[PDB]
Amino acid sequence: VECPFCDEVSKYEKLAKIGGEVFKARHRKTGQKVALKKVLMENEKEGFPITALREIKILQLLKHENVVNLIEICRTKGSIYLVFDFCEHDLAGLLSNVLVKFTLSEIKRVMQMLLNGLYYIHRNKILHRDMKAANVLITRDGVLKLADFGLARAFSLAKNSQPNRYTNRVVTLWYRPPELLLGERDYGPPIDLWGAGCIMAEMWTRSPIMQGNTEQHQLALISQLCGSITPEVWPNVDNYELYEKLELVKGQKRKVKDRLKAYVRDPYALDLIDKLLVLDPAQRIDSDDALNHDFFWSDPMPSDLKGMLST
Amino acid sequence: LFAEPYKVTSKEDKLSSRIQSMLGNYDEMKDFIG
Amino acid sequence: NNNKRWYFTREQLENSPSRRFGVDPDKELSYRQQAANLLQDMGQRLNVSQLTINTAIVYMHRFYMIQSFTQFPGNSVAPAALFLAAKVEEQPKKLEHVIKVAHTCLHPQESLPDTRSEAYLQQVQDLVILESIILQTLGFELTIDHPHTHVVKCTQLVRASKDLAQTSYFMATNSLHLTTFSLQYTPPVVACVCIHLACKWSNWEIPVSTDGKHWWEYVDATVTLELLDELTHEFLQILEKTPNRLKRIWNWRAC
Amino acid sequence: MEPVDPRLEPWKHPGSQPKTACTNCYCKKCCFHCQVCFITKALGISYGR
RNA sequence: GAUCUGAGCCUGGGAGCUCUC
Ligand SMILES: [Zn+2]
Ligand SMILES: [Zn+2]
């Protein structure tokens, strides 16, 4: 049984468990550190999961200094394994550790690389649809890397005609944007930034600002923070078949900056977060304009993270 | 940038005639292709 | 050197995996044409975009560049190939639908096996397993570029008429069904061959750009008149080797 | 048989199935009805059962 | 009669036909 274009996973040596899905192995010969991601073929109802095909098809395309690199794909003497360039830390883990200290300068660098990464994937017509501190890796040299593109795919620029009908149930409930919670299937890049805004808020809160247990509960929290969802602030929001069928508060006002006031502290920082957590995706600032925000061009200026990683 | 294509007065190209004697007369097999 | 991977020469093709198990050159190509025909037939019955079909055809040509018809039947790889291309081209078709249509084309006599029968459950595994094999054999390189993409862009630029545009695109499909240029020349080059081949047959001649440059120069910087004529020669040479009537159909007979 | 704008996304491309049911005639008109007819009728290439 | 003990080939795709037995 010929198979020259698919080396055996035996070439790697498993060390520990991550994410029995993701493992930390090292090349038996070179000694290079890598991340083994086993393909979950639990649902063999439709052969090889289309979700995997996309991730693989996308990773082979995307190649940025802020995006995880896909080395190769191994097998078993069978199951499939996706090899990536091992990442020492992860935004999620770092924020969880108290010993870790983030300076206003270092924080700006983290987001700068994050948004810079989104700009790439978005420019290449790709949607992550799963933004969270957990998927935000950071190399040993202090280089942010976007990983886990399982729920990621490619969207279209709607040729001014019949809209698209993508999957609705996407992105973590905690990092899921309003539109998705209203039944929006013709979404786009804005859904990713919403998570980025929630992630940038955790850089000071060290914990998810909106932890809902259900879809409706999530909306309630978003309405109490970002304010009540009304046609005024969200034009044509009433068109949603779930707008009226879902009891949403009407009195709650926008208190994004007010709630994150004692945390963020920094003026510019608060302003950016406010533009990223905008209810209406049409008015939601994009990655491009996000990088041009005074937040990234005001003293103190962004700097590497090596100093912080020393703890 | 380009000019709208035109017909060729008696295709003398050896390649052209080779196709004509293979697939047949063009004009007569167009309203069927697609 | 990932580019030159799925691009061989006339000699390499002359020594294909199948040629290693004793399979005449003209015989192998025959299997390829048949495999492409099956994919085209099943695709239309599944109502899938031409893109999905072409993509499936490409995998077929490349798949047999590492494997042999002696080990992998063309009527078996086709179903799996098409089933895979469907997903890649954002147009997946239920495994049940594929097997059903594939059985209608391969077994017009026998009746469609019950979705509960032991025989059916078997065909499922065989197709799924073969699918994984195709992926590994291709190195998981699903991304494929078709000449049709370059053919359409060129026709619109040269301001070619519909009849000419339809023919150009038409020949672009025949190349994947009869020839193996998809394993020899890049899509851009193949696109020029189709248009050039369509022009000679349509008597249409594409003028020279207002800048003094040929049309093919706007499709590929490595394409030359000498190449087109040579390639067009091989294309037709393969067309002449067809086992059916292409001279008797020159009439307006009834139905 | 009919050209398709590449700029269009995979999930946007139209089906390959011909508008009219693949007729059953060897006439010079049906030989080009579709891709299959051309390969099976004009070229006479079949996969058989 | 097979028809992975085969096919050549062709009229409206066989409902046509002959080949080494
Ligand atoms: Zn007819
Ligand atoms: Zn037809």
Side-chain angles (χ1 to χ4, degrees), chain A residues 125 154 156 162 164, chain D residues 7-9 11-12:
Chain A
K125 303 167 62 180
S156 181
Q162 49 283 175
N164 302 300
Chain D
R7 296 176 296 182
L8 298 176
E9 300 298 358
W11 65 76
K12 290 296 181 179

Side-chain angles (χ1 to χ4, degrees), chain A residues 50 53-54 57 153, chain C residues 48-59 81-93 141-146 149, chain D residues 6 8-14:
Chain A
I50 182 178
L53 292 174
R54 297 180 178 179
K57 188 180 185 62
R153 61 169 299 180
Chain C
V48 300
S49 63
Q50 184 60 59
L51 180 63
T52 302
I53 301 178
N54 299 303
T55 304
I57 301 176
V58 179
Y59 299 135
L82 182 60
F83 178 61
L84 178 62
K87 303 177 181 179
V88 182
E89 306 311 303
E90 297 300 300
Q91 287 188 57
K93 297 297 181 179
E141 187 176 301
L142 305 177
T143 302
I144 300 300
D145 184 58
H146 304 301
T149 298
Chain D
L8 298 176
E9 300 298 358
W11 65 76
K12 290 296 181 179
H13 294 183

Side-chain angles (χ1 to χ4, degrees), chain C residues 37 44 48 91 166 245 249, chain D residues 2 10 16 28 36 42 44-45:
Chain C
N37 183 188
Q44 292 182 297
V48 300
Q91 287 188 57
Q166 300 179 300
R245 344 75 58 63
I249 60 177
Chain D
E2 181 62 56
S16 60
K28 183 176 176 302
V36 176
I45 301 178

Side-chain angles (χ1 to χ4, degrees), chain D residues 18 21-23 30 33-34 36-37:
Chain D
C22 299
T23 60
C30 297
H33 176 296
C34 65
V36 176
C37 295

Side-chain angles (χ1 to χ4, degrees), chain D:
Chain D
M1 304 298 265
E2 181 62 56
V4 181
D5 182 59
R7 296 176 296 182
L8 298 176
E9 300 298 358
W11 65 76
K12 290 296 181 179
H13 294 183
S16 60
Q17 181 178 179
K19 304 300 179 181
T20 60
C22 299
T23 60
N24 197 183
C25 181
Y26 261 167
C27 66
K28 183 176 176 302
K29 303 187 177 182
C30 297
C31 296
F32 293 62
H33 176 296
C34 65
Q35 185 58 59
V36 176
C37 295
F38 178 65
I39 303 299
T40 60
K41 301 182 179 181
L43 303 179
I45 301 178
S46 60
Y47 48 65
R49 65 292 77 181

